[PDB]
Write a protein that binds this DNA or RNA. Structure first.
Ligand SMILES: [Zn+2]
Ligand SMILES: [Zn+2]
Lengths: 222, 114, 100, 537, 92
RNA sequence: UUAAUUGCGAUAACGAACGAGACCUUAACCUACUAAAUAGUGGUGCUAGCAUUUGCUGGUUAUCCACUUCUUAGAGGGACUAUCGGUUUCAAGCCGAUGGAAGUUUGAGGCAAUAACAGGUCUGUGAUGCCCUUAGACGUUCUGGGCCGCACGCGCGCUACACUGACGGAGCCAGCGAGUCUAACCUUGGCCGAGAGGUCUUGGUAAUCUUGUGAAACUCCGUCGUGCUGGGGAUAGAGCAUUGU
RNA sequence: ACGGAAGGGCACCACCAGGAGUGGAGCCUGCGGCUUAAUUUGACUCAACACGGGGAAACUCACCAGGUCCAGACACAAUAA
């Protein structure tokens, strides 16, 4: 007996917990978001990552314990939750997955420009319309300063921004301070596979078909 | 209960009425819901519940393998096994006897005796 | 039987698909019913100061969620009901079934 | 039985450490046809023995007072109701008693009818008449008339006949003339056996007949009752979805539960000998297996081909020499009767084989010779019943041991040997086990190791029944349509909409050649393409 | 922590059969879920034990999820004095 | 010229990209599609009053039938400044009239480029480098005060300084939104009390109960009378209650 | 980039013709100052001053006068049934 105005926000609250839960537990495996699928008498949660085997563990030990770990706190009946693992596709075109490359590549000691240049070349090689990498913090100097790296073209205002561009923000913690990483990926509208195929401000004109004048009446019968 | 809802499921979607599973006149299976709502048969309206040598010899002899037939399907978990000639059949009940090797310490003790 | 099913999902586009199949199954089952009654969409608003600190011009933003409720009344024996609940399962859509 | 969360496929490097390549595969396409329905056995202990049938004529016959629990959820549902039901019982678990439910179903409501039995093989036809000619006719006054390719009785006898047994190929010809055949007007119930043979050569003929009554029932606005006998069918939902059976009445049990228990053994054999040398390696295990598993009880062997029938007898008799009794298990103490019995033996292999207690059977002998090899087995004179896989459909041999002599049968279409299908050996397992003679039955599945792992997974389970009518689709499409029923291509899509292929094509697009789209819409044009591909031909 | 050890025993054996435990960051609520004793003893009985590479911690909205290690459960086994390969938290 | 390097044009430039626009949400039109006792309407039954002559005003959930105009919607169409007339190298455009639901980017917002502040926040963060403290700790907790303390200066506001009013009766109209499960939320109705409020049930997890949220300014009748007055209620005294230890 | 240099553009966070005001009184509230043990503290032209969603009796609380508790994990050595 729960109000629907509260039941639905509960799911959003429920959805909010796992996202933080997994990104703090499975980040090292390249956590790429979660999906919540509810079904009568059982609800299933899908976890997507790159190193699914590490996510799985030996004979699904990590998967088994994660279900139980979710089971105990979230107060469900036994057997009502099952967790799946599957390979995330299009690893180049994934803001959350690609931004973790910055977090890894910055921590090992790699330079800044080369690391950012590596990602923008990687994303463009993955058939992306445009990329954007922003790194901010104390970069080899006392004064903070932010570098920006871009290639291709991107849009910045309007609804198509919320459709074609995915943004990822990651905090990198070094021994000198905290660095902020921002990634924007402009996917190809034609390869959307859902919704719009191109920006609203573009028009396509079909080529006219050319036919010579008949110049003489003709009749065709059965 | 006097309910007029004639549940003709014949036990398909409901458990059968254990006391009175089937009709003796037209063979209709009476489920649990079909049992309490009416004491009469749904189809032929015959009485469903009445208010070893003496019995027919075939009837009590009949039910002997029905218990076995139910036993066969109840105990069919291991009946589906395949013998083959490449199975270990490890002689172990469920474990390696606590993972300790001292019961076979007599084997080389016997060799010592040999 | 007068079984009742309600749909209280948050995304309209799937809701119509769920409603569209349910209604077309019922007619080809040839079952008496009332059409999907589209309850008014209730908007949940949350107004909040944009800035985390207190400095700056007073700017407020209002986030929203849309809640859409469709319920369809059916009358049929139990056998049709169970398979209906077994089918038409879509993400983000929760359906509750009640009799009488 | 417990559904796994996923399916994991692991690949590892055998020489390098840490070179791991693994993938996890999920499954969400669990649809209702993708489900074994099955039926658990529930307590309905008290039967209706004989007297609870309310017919003195029936109660005067069938001295069986034991009423079969293996028909529990069936019982009298088909007795009174007029809705289709599927009843599957393997071996000798109702081939006789259940086949008589047609008389009990509706014949009392309207007597003097011509309800037709259909048997997929002429071998079934002969036994369905010989046993029931002295069981139904003398008491019910109803004559039995055979309709096969070899027998052409007068139409007046066929019209006045009550029990009619016809092969599906012969039944197709009568149904080919359904528009003007005034004989076929009184069909109220059709009883069938060995349903699961849709994938066989006669399956398209078998399948097309069933779809014919569906339109006849729909157009005429009265139902035509259908009854089919078969073995454990995996795709029972499509079995229910296409036969038009109702919820009330159904019978499908797995091979684990039988009136007589069955024991299956698997024997792999090397993958180097193509077909010739791989009998000498396995013939000797066959001989000892008979001694091992059938000490003093009947056995049965099934050779791969006609020549294998002879060579098996040559070696087995040769191996029988190196032991105590050369004429082992001859079961003929009277020498005078032995010479009389050996007098009727004609020539060749049967002449020098019957003395050893070993029987030989193949389709190259005199008609009376085949009975002789079986008449002796009726008295258990000879234990070995070596034959070819054709006899797995004929007379019910009361044997206990059934050894699958090799695997893979030659196919002239591919100019090579192709493996066995899981419709013959499943029925072959039914031959093992003797009713009221021995407790359990034993059978061995001598084969290659390559298919050993495969068969060990699925011999107990089995595969769903499929349809292969789209190889001869041109011939049998005009069976119902050449009379002038449909003139537009639009209705041609509806023509197969009531066929079993339409059920399975959407459910199993991969098996039917569909590889582009798995959705129901994608099947439509492919089904239309099959409709199209026929008309240009 | 100055308190009787039989409380350690049940919570430790409780951590044994499933291997996963959670505990609110709420000091002095006096009740822990499906554990008779109170949180402060339960909560501090694990990061006094996480130290030697035995079990893990996750902050994750101050909810303190805990998971054990392969050597840690075996370390816990002599505490429970039970035969090896008897009952794991992720046993088949 | 446009709100806009918004677009014309004279041109050593042509052709483009980001921002603007386009886009998304919302408010306006649909007697057109699909509808709908948790929304209405009309009619049909029972039934009350007046007139009785055929009517008007009502009430009624098992008393039934029909439809979707108003009500909620989902899918759509519609406006592009349309037509005409003026002005302009007669180009972008601007003005007037007609029609139109809409002709001030249709009204209003959401998003909003390159870049900069050494802008604010370590008191939002289990974000944070360093420093400081770490056991009579600046950690945490319990008791009592303070954050309200006043001779004063400023900033945003609420009352008003009266008859276009103040006061007493009656007339009587909205929209946005919210509301309890292991709790005690929103409360109708009956009773008591001037009032605050108290008491017993009721309905509601909500288009169906609060709720038609009968709000106020306002409309009509009466009292007052240009008197720092019945304007204004600051500063105060006594008493009756509510919440909360 | 800057200019205490000149054009041209815009803008009811400029003016124009006006409307409503504020600034004048009481009170509420915030800041500075005074005071105190503390009257916690950030922000000082637009771009701080019913702002920190800050309408604080206890908590919040960051301040003052006081009384407790230790949540110093862990390792090493020490006392020691
Ligand atoms: Zn039932
Ligand atoms: Zn009966």
């Amino acid at each position: 007996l729960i109000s629907k105005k509260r039941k639905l926000v509960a799911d959003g609250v429920f959805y909010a917990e796992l996202n933080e839960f997994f990104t703090r537990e499975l980040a090292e495996e390249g956590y790429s978001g979660v999906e919540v699928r509810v079904t009568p008498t059982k609800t299933e949660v899908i976890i997507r990552a790159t190193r699914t085997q590490d996510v799985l563990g030996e004979n699904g030990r990590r998967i088994n314990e994660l279900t139980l770990l979710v089971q105990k706190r979230f107060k469900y009946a036994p057997g009502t939750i099952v967790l799946y693992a599957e390979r995330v596709q299009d690893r180049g075109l994934s803001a959350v997955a690609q931004a973790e490359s910055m977090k890894f590549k910055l921590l090992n000691g790699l330079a800044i420009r080369r690391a950012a240049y590596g990602v923008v070349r990687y994303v463009m090689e993955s058939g992306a319309k445009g990329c954007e990498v922003v790194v901010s913090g104390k970069l080899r100097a006392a004064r903070a300063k932010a570098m920006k790296f871009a290639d291709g073209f991107l849009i910045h205002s309007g609804q198509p921004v919320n459709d074609f561009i995915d943004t990822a923000t990651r905090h990198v913690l070094m021994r000198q301070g905290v660095l902020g990483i921002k990634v924007k990926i402009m996917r190809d509208p034609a390869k959307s596979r859902t919704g719009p195929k191109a920006l609203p401000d573009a028009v396509t004109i079909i080529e006219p078909k050319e036919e010579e004048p008949i110049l003489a009446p003709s009749v065709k019968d059965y | 209960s006097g309910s007029s809802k004639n549940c003709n499921c014949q036990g398909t979607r409901h458990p059968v009425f254990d006391i009175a599973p089937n009709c003796l006149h037209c063979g209709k299976v009476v489920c649990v819901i079909e049992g309490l709502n009416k004491g009469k048969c749904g189809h032929c309206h015959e009485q469903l519940i009445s208010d070893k040598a003496e019995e027919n010899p075939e009837l009590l002899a009949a039910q002997e393998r029905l218990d076995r037939l139910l036993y066969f399907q109840d105990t069919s978990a291991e009946r589906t096994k395949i013998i083959d000639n490449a199975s270990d059949f490890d002689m172990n009940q469920e474990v390696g006897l606590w993972g300790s090797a001292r019961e076979r310490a007599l084997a080389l003790k016997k060799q010592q005796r040999n | 039987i007068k079984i009742r099913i309600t749909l209280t999902s948050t995304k309209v586009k799937q809701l119509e698909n769920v409603s569209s199949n349910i209604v077309k199954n019922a007619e080809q089952h040839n079952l008496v019913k009332k059409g999907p009654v589209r309850l008014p969409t209730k908007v949940l608003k949350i107004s909040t100061r944009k800035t985390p600190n207190g400095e700056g011009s007073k700017t407020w933003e209002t986030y929203e969620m849309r809640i859409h409720k469709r319920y369809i009344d059916l009358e049929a024996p139990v056998q049709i009901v169970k398979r209906i609940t077994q089918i038409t399962i879509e993400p983000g859509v929760d359906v509750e079934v009640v009799v009488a | 039985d417990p559904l796994p969360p996923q399916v994991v496929v692991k690949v590892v490097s055998d020489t390098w450490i840490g070179c791991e390549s693994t993938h996890a595969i999920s499954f969400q396409h669990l649809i209702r046809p993708f489900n074994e329905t099955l039926q658990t056995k529930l307590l309905k202990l008290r039967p209706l023995p004989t007297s609870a049938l309310q017919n003195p004529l029936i109660e005067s016959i069938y001295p069986f007072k034991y009423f079969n629990p293996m028909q529990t959820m069936t019982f009298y549902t088909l007795y009174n109701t007029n809705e289709n039901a599927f009843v599957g019982s393997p071996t000798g678990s109702g081939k006789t008693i259940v086949a008589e439910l047609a008389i009990w179903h509706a014949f009392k409501t309207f007597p003097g009818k011509k309800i037709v039995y259909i048997a997929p093989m002429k071998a079934l036809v002969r036994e369905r008449v010989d046993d029931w000619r002295k069981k139904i006719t003398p008491v019910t006054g109803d004559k039995v008339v055979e309709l096969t390719g070899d027998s052409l009785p007068d139409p007046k006898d066929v019209h006045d006949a009550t029990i009619v047994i016809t092969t599906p190929e012969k039944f197709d010809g009568i149904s080919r003339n359904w528009q003007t055949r005034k004989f076929v007007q009184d069909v109220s119930l059709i009883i069938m056996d060995e349903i699961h043979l849709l994938a066989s050569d006669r399956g398209p003929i078998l399948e097309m007949i069933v779809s014919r009554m569906n339109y006849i029932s729909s157009q005429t606005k009265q139902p035509v009752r259908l009854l089919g006998m078969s073995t454990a069918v995996s795709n029972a939902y499509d079995m229910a979805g296409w036969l038009g059976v109702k919820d009330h009445g159904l019978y499908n049990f797995p091979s684990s539960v039988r009136p007589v228990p069955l024991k299956m053994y698997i024997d792999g054999f090397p993958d180097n000998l193509a077909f010739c040398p791989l009998m000498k390696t396995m013939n000797k295990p066959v001989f000892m297996a008979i001694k091992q598993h059938s000490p003093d009880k009947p056995a049965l062997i099934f050779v791969a081909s006609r020549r294998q029938t002879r060579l098996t007898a040559l070696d087995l008799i040769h191996l029988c020499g190196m032991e105590d009794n050369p004429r082992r298990f001859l079961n003929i103490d009277d020498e005078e009767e032995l010479q009389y019995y050996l007098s009727q033996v004609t020539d060749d292999t049967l002449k020098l084989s019957l003395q050893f207690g070993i029987g030989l059977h193949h389709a190259g002998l005199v008609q009376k010779d085949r009975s002789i090899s079986h008449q002796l087995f009726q008295k258990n004179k000879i234990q070995i019943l070596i034959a070819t896989s054709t006899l797995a459909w004929g007379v019910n041999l009361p044997a206990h041991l059934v050894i699958i002599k090799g695997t893979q049968f030659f196919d002239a279409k591919i100019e090579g040997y192709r493996d066995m299908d899981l419709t013959d050996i499943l029925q072959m397992m039914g031959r093992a086990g003797r009713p009221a003679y021995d407790t359990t039955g034993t059978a061995i599945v001598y084969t290659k190791e390559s298919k050993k792992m495969f068969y060990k997974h699925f011999l107990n389970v089995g595969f769903p029944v499929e349809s292969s009518l789209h190889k001869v689709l041109d011939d049998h499409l005009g069976a119902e349509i050449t009379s002038g029923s449909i003139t537009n291509k639009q209705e041609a899509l509806d023509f197969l909409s009531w066929t079993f292929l339409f059920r399975r094509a959407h459910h199993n697009p991969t098996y039917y050649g569909i590889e582009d789209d798995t959705s129901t819409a994608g099947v439509s044009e492919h089904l239309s393409s099959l409709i199209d591909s026929t008309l240009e031909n | 922590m100055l308190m009787p050890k039989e409380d350690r025993n049940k919570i430790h054996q409780y951590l044994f059969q499933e291997g996963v435990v959670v505990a609110k960051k709420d000091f002095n609520q006096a009740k822990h879920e499906e554990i008779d004793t109170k949180n402060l003893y339960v909560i501090k009985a694990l990061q006094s034990l996480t130290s030697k590479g035995y079990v893990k911690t996750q902050f994750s909205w101050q909810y303190y999820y805990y998971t054990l290690t392969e050597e840690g459960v075996e370390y816990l086994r002599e505490y429970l004095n039970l035969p090896e390969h008897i009952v794991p938290g992720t046993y088949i």
